[PDB]
Design an enzyme around this catalytic site. Structure first.
Site, PDB file in Angstrom:
ATOM      1  N   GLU A  36       0.835  -1.181   0.000  1.00  0.00           N
ATOM      2  CA  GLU A  36       0.000   0.000   0.000  1.00  0.00           C
ATOM      3  C   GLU A  36       0.867   1.227   0.000  1.00  0.00           C
ATOM      4  O   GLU A  36       0.509   2.208  -0.609  1.00  0.00           O
ATOM      5  CB  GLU A  36      -0.911   0.062   1.215  1.00  0.00           C
ATOM      6  CG  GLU A  36      -2.082  -0.857   1.164  1.00  0.00           C
ATOM      7  CD  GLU A  36      -3.080  -0.527   0.064  1.00  0.00           C
ATOM      8  OE1 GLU A  36      -3.039   0.569  -0.508  1.00  0.00           O
ATOM      9  OE2 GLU A  36      -3.911  -1.389  -0.233  1.00  0.00           O
ATOM     10  N   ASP A  54      -6.259   8.038  -0.743  1.00  0.00           N
ATOM     11  CA  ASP A  54      -5.895   7.159   0.356  1.00  0.00           C
ATOM     12  C   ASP A  54      -4.692   7.654   1.122  1.00  0.00           C
ATOM     13  O   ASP A  54      -3.737   8.177   0.542  1.00  0.00           O
ATOM     14  CB  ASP A  54      -5.635   5.739  -0.138  1.00  0.00           C
ATOM     15  CG  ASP A  54      -6.761   5.209  -0.954  1.00  0.00           C
ATOM     16  OD1 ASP A  54      -7.936   5.291  -0.503  1.00  0.00           O
ATOM     17  OD2 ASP A  54      -6.475   4.746  -2.081  1.00  0.00           O
TER      18      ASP A  54
END
Length: 126
Positions: A36, A54
């Site tokens: 991520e 994000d």
């Protein structure tokens, strides 16, 4: 400046476990951090197709999980400002990812695919 605050597989685990994250999650969480964000608490994603963004090491979403530094609506399920993930501490990210995990599970991460299989034991970190 957006210098990385970079954790390692093990430092992230150790700190996660310290924060009360069961061990049996740690390999998965580190895996997810890696893919991520490269373990970077300061990571901020590119705009997603839906216009969201994000935040942090677990790339928590500003539409649903955290509140953006704008006046934009967010369901803000973690009741945090996204930008608060952008700190040296993983705790706000961990806490929020915990809630995500409990509510939507591991498939919540688009990187879960890199992580859903055979992972090393995290106990070399301990």
């Amino acid at each position: 400046e957006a210098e990385a605050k970079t954790f390692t597989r093990c430092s992230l685990a150790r700190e996660m476990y310290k924060l009360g994250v069961p061990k049996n999650q740690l390999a998965r969480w580190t895996c997810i951090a890696e893919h991520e964000s490269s373990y970077n608490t300061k990571a901020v994603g590119s705009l997603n197709s839906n216009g969201s963004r994000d935040y942090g090491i677990f790339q928590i979403n500003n539409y649903y999980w955290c509140s953006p530094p704008s006046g934009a609506f967010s369901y803000d399920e973690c009741k945090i400002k996204c930008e608060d993930f952008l700190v040296d501490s993983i705790e706000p990210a961990v806490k929020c990812a915990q809630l995500v995990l409990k509510q939507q599970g591991w498939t919540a991460w688009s990187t879960w695919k890199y992580c859903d299989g055979t992972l090393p034991s995290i106990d070399d970190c301990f």
